């Protein structure tokens, strides 16, 4: 039960059950108005939950929502790995340069 190949099979699942999932046309789910995806895990997986709590728990559909649930706890795993290892000043500032550098190069602003 790995992770790095979950997404590959998970995305492929979403490509099929799309027509089934988008059958609910009254349902409104929070969608970020920006393209910095990783800042919005709490809202994305809360949306996945609401979409789960309003979907016919079918056959190949019910697997998608566990794979999404499994991906969450990998993300939940990485989250606590952000702040439980205290290291020496200044390895923190080293990390900060990269952080601000990424925001400068990668992010849309």
């Amino acid at each position: 039960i790995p992770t790095s190949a979950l997404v590959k099979e998970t995305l492929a699942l979403l490509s099929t059950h799309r027509t089934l999932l988008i059958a609910n046309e009254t349902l409104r789910i929070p969608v970020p108005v920006h393209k910095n995806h990783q800042l919005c895990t709490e809202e994305i997986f809360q949306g996945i939950g609401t979409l789960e709590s309003q979907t016919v728990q079918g056959g190949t559909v019910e697997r998608l929502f566990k794979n999404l649930s499994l991906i969450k706890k990998y993300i939940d795993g990485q989250k606590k790995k952000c702040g439980e290892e205290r290291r020496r000043v200044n390895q923190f500032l080293d990390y900060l340069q990269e952080f601000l550098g990424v925001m400068n190069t990668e992010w849309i602003i």
Binding site: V7, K8, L11, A12, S15, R28, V33, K35, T105, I108, I109
Partner: protein, 307 residues
Amino acid sequence: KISLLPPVNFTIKVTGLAQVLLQWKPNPDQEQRNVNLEYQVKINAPKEDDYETRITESKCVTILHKGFSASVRTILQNDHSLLASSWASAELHAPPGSPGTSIVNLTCTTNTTEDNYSRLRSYQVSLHCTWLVGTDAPEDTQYFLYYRYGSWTEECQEYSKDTLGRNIACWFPRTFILSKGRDWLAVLVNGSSKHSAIRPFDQLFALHAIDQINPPLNVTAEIEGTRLSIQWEKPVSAFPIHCFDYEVKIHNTRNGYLQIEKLMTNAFISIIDDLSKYDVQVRAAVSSMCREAGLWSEWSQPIYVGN
């Protein structure tokens, strides 16, 4: 005891190429806020949509050359009931000009190359756009190209022209377009004539749909007696290595026996004969795992191997 009042001061302003900001304010005559109100945005034209928001403004990315129309409600919902006020509407009138004055068949293409001129960034992104003039297009009219990616807008400076010296194609060797970008490319072709009015044309492109993928590089095939050994390199793109789909085509030049493998790894080996000559080509496309499905690259230059 609540009767829902519609929002007021509902505005729509163009904030950039194919980009508007909807703005409204809560009705001050609405009974003193003791319950949290929200809003429902409805877009009537040119493309229908509707959604909700907790705040009093919303950005909409949309083409503008057909005009634009939107409406906004006040919504109050619990579980027992849902209340929706009347609509506050606003529209941007379609651009002045005749239908046949606009350009025809706007086709744009992005390509990624290596940037050695600049240590500041990795990879360039080029923009090549073509179009037709139009049947009712005047003989004296001229066109102007503009594009927008994110918050940056640029006007074209490399125009190809037709017989009458009116612009028909554009070229950007360098753009602000991010090579691993995941936002829209808004393109605008405007017009002008002293003797008529010209309807402009804009279009939203997704990068995965217009990005021409470069071929796999250093495609080599070696014959070690009874087997074929093929290797290439992940093409000039900003995308990494674990994100590429490849097709490798082994063609028996003798009888025409054919074998194609769709794979992601960067090398391939299979059986053949010591007897026949083979030609090998490779083909690249960004995997469906990093981006949405896009174009394939051209097949690599045919490397005939064996005998």
